[PDB]
């Protein structure tokens, strides 16, 4: 998009787009490459990456992340906080002193690539772990499930 104007310049360096003088090899006529780091455990390159210029250095479908350690999921709750989302992994604690359970949940912080949009409240988002990104966001968004009414078309 009109994305090329962050406070540096960004592109893909694998196969050179300036290798032809006439403006047919540069961004120009035929779009430059955009390398997709080997993605897997069921994961691949959906619409977004191919259809657009959606690069991020901490993207899970691109960038220098490594989805390892554990693999989890959660629910979409609060859509503020540009480029970062907060998700509740509601579980119910279990006790042995008493033979009953307790309620306790941990809220999770994830960055979400400009790839994914039209995210709405109340669905599932699957998540992975990669290199520590910041104080809170230690995770990565992968899939979005439910963005429509509950029982109709």
């Amino acid at each position: 998009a009109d994305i090329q104007t962050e406070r540096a310049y960004q592109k893909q360096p694998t196969i050179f787009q300036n290798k032809k003088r006439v403006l047919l090899g540069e961004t120009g006529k035929e779009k430059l490459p955009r390398y997709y780091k080997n993605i897997g455990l069921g994961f691949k390159t959906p619409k977004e990456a191919i259809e657009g210029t959606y690069i991020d250095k901490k993207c899970p479908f691109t960038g220098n992340v490594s989805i390892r350690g554990r693999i989890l999921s959660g629910v979409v709750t609060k859509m503020k906080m540009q480029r970062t989302i907060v998700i509740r992994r509601d579980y119910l604690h279990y006790i042995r002193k008493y033979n009953r359970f307790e309620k306790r949940h941990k809220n999770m912080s994830v960055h979400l690539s400009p790839c994914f949009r039209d995210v709405q409240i109340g669905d599932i988002v699957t998540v992975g772990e990669c290199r520590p990104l910041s104080k809170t966001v230690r995770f990565n968004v992968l899939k979005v499930t439910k963005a429509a009414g509950t029982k109709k078309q």
Binding site: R7, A8, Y9, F16, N18, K19, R21, K135, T136
Partner: protein, 103 residues
């Protein structure tokens, strides 16, 4: 006297990760200045792991390549026409990553 610290920062909810230990040499924040163009001056610094790395003081020339033919020469940093974080590093003439120069 400068050294990096993470637990020094407030916690997620406005609390404070209180101290529990002594500030170590693992966490360094080594102080320096920014290398403009001038007389070539460098010093090695003895850092973590006994390894020693090269901190610049001043320098003029390096290795500038060309992409559309991929060929480097050794040219002069006369000036600095843009840096990508603040509006005054242009004039300050630092030497940083993705620094923009009219050379």
């Amino acid at each position: 006297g400068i050294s990096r610290d993470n637990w020094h920062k407030r916690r997620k909810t406005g609390g404070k990760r209180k101290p529990y230990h002594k500030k170590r040499k693992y966490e360094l924040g080594r102080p320096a200045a920014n290398t403009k163009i001038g007389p070539r001056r460098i010093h090695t610094v003895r850092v973590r792991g006994g390894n020693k790395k090269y901190r610049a003081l001043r320098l003029d020339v390096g290795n500038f390549s060309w992409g559309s033919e991929c060929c480097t020469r050794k040219t002069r940093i006369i000036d600095v026409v843009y840096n990508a974080s603040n509006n005054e590093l242009v004039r300050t003439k630092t030497l940083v990553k993705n620094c923009i120069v009219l050379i």
